[PDB]
Amino acid sequence: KTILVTAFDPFGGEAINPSWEAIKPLQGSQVFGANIEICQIPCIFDTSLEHLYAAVDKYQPELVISVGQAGGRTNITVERVAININDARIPDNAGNQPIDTPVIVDGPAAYFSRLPIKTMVNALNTAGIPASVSQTAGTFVCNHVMYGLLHYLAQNTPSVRGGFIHVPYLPEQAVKDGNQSSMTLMLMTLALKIAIETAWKNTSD
Amino acid sequence: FQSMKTILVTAFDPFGGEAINPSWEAIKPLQGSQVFGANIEICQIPCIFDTSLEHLYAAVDKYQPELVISVGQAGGRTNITVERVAININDARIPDNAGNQPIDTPVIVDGPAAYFSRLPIKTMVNALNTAGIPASVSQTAGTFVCNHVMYGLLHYLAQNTPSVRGGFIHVPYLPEQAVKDGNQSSMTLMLMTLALKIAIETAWKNTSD
Amino acid sequence: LYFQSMKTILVTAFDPFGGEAINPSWEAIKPLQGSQVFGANIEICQIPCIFDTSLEHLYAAVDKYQPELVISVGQAGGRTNITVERVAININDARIPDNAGNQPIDTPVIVDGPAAYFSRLPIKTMVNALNTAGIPASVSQTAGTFVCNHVMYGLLHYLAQNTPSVRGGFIHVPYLPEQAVKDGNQSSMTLMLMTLALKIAIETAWKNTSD
Amino acid sequence: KTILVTAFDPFGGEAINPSWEAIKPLQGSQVFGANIEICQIPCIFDTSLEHLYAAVDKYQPELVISVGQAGGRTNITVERVAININDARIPDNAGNQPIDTPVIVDGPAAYFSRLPIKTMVNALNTAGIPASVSQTAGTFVCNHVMYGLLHYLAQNTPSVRGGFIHVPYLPEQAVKDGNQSSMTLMLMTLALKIAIETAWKNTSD
Ligand SMILES: [Cl-]
Ligand SMILES: [Cl-]
Ligand SMILES: [Cl-]
Ligand SMILES: [Cl-]
Ligand SMILES: [Cl-]
Ligand SMILES: [Cl-]
Ligand SMILES: [Cl-]
Ligand SMILES: [Cl-]
Ligand SMILES: [Cl-]
Ligand SMILES: [Cl-]
Ligand SMILES: [Cl-]
Ligand SMILES: [Cl-]
Ligand SMILES: [Cl-]
Ligand SMILES: [Cl-]
Ligand SMILES: [Cl-]
């Protein structure tokens, strides 16, 4: 049994992406009889989704957790819902900047996360790690991937649960001095380990 | 041959009902360090107006440090902050650990309005940033026991041992402290301790900005 | 030919909630009562801050006034500006109880309704009209999970099922200065600025069919 | 009996300064047996203080209140203390960007405001206007002026009380979509009116 965990390459002028750095130590790890496979996907509209679909079809996971950077957030956030819209504040890594276009034409307006998000947030908080449910994953490539994931799973393999977790800046990214919050890499990896284990052990909230 | 010198690092007891103060937890691993020609000595100060200062004076007299760095917690701040200035006022929003809640009283009667930190604060902030640790200069240490101690420290050194440099550093909440409702930033204990190591070493090795 | 009925814009706001004695959403739209713009008369309606009951009152108002445009207003304490909502989501998750003591946890607004409805208002044009008037405003991607989002969802669903040509959406106002006096560094906007902003937003929505 | 109120001209890239806009309607109004006189001073280190020095020597005020813009603040703030340092994040209006230089060479490290700051904040809050005491007026031209003012009065006319009030952005300045707080001009002017009258009527705190 496989858990697929995805993250992104650096974007928006950054030299690092905490989502990828944080999941690297999880590769090959066992989660109660499931093993973790990681995959890096490009921060590019549509191309990102092609990488995602290819990874899902290759690994045939029972659980998919996609991870992204949410610079400025203070804590770990587990996303409640993905919406069917691209509205890019900045260009992606290939220079695309879609304004109010659908992620999937004629797809539904939204998909709820299929992860046990409350249980995950409570496990994190109980472990002394600040975490909360988020009601918006943005309208950039992270939400795009969350929506595409949930749509793909619903259309092909409905018993497979997918969802999204955002991590904050690493300290090295918050040095730029706009009074930005951070979380160490060590703490991020621990938080993701707990969140993934919790999602695996608990089918629903 | 030459004498080892002494760096005194202080931190506080927990306050406002908390069970821990990360300022103390962060400096505990530094006790007994013999590094770059200096013995590091630490001391826990009660979070009580005036009594804190008596403990501070006793520690300075005991260790006869060539450098003093006092540490406190500033829950809500996003990074490590190095204080520019201590002001001669107490104005407590909550009571201290002895129940005192002074409103607009001097730290030292007829002392000057303020003391600038004598630490190389820009150099320290730059050393932290360069090491990948978020940090900034702060223009206010608050009006609670932390500012009280910063002021009392700088006044005591000025009056008694002017060549000794003192100052103050604030750490943010620990992650476990930020779990409560609210959008509060945090920094791990491990990162705090690393940041304090860098700050102390930089302060010791740089006489001015 | 003669006595051609004017079109109608329905603007709703809420009762006070959360222990407040005032709701600026209602205070801000009161001056719009008995007004008209570009061939449409404005009708206002105050709805209870109660899950499900709020929706009952909304449906009754819509049926009564047969509006061609519906804009619902609520307070989002802590926001810095005027926000125009992009999307309503099919969930109730109450941080605090409503005015009747209900505190639903992760229940649908409408059972077996879609997961979301996008606002049908020209939200970018409304935001730009506010900004160019000198009034801070932004598009929001979340109306929360309390009664405001609940009403936005129910409105969009009701219109979709019954009168699909009718456009609806939601606008949040921040705290009034008096509400922000409590400790905690809260942002605010005066009632006068809120009323001006809603006037501009409503006029822009009525005159622009799309973004 | 003249109450003196000062404000600044636009700085940074700004087109307007709320401090000046807010105090204009206050010109010539009486406050319990005193007149208000206003003066605009340039946002330039040292040059600012000369204009200030001239104005105090001209109207011979029993009360001086200087006002400035604190973009980002959510409320009206009354400054507790001025410090003897210039440390400019951006150049002033003449291109000067001093780094850690004294406001007055060999002046004391700081001067406390001589205004009844707690009474002023209480009066504002009671009027339904968010306000607080601030412990830092920055290290730009506003603090520079506050310090130079308090030094001047202490050296020449110790019975004359001086201090500083910061106003937030006007709404039109917060349009930039950087999530900035604001206060309308109407509210600022009322706040300043109340704060000034409170300062006048209450000699202590
Ligand atoms: Cl975006
Ligand atoms: Cl819950
Ligand atoms: Cl976004
Ligand atoms: Cl942040
Ligand atoms: Cl790290
Ligand atoms: Cl604290
Ligand atoms: Cl305090
Ligand atoms: Cl500061
Ligand atoms: Cl920790
Ligand atoms: Cl750690
Ligand atoms: Cl009703
Ligand atoms: Cl108002
Ligand atoms: Cl500055
Ligand atoms: Cl500044
Ligand atoms: Cl205005």
PDB file of C-alpha atoms and ligand atoms in Angstrom, chain A residues 87-89 136-141 143, chain C residues 141, ligand 3:
ATOM      1  CA  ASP A  87      -6.543  33.676 -10.781  1.00  0.00           C
ATOM      2  CA  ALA A  88      -2.837  34.309 -10.693  1.00  0.00           C
ATOM      3  CA  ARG A  89      -1.408  37.209  -8.679  1.00  0.00           C
ATOM      4  CA  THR A 136      -8.996  28.852   1.041  1.00  0.00           C
ATOM      5  CA  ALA A 137      -5.992  27.330  -0.702  1.00  0.00           C
ATOM      6  CA  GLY A 138      -5.661  30.486  -2.794  1.00  0.00           C
ATOM      7  CA  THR A 139      -6.213  30.715  -6.549  1.00  0.00           C
ATOM      8  CA  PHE A 140      -2.656  30.024  -7.727  1.00  0.00           C
ATOM      9  CA  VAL A 141      -0.992  26.695  -8.526  1.00  0.00           C
ATOM     10  CA  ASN A 143      -5.362  25.371  -5.289  1.00  0.00           C
TER      11      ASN A 143
ATOM     12  CA  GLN C 141     -12.024  33.629  -1.458  1.00  0.00           C
TER      13      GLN C 141
HETATM   14 CL    CL E   3      -3.630  32.897  -4.381  1.00  0.00          CL
END
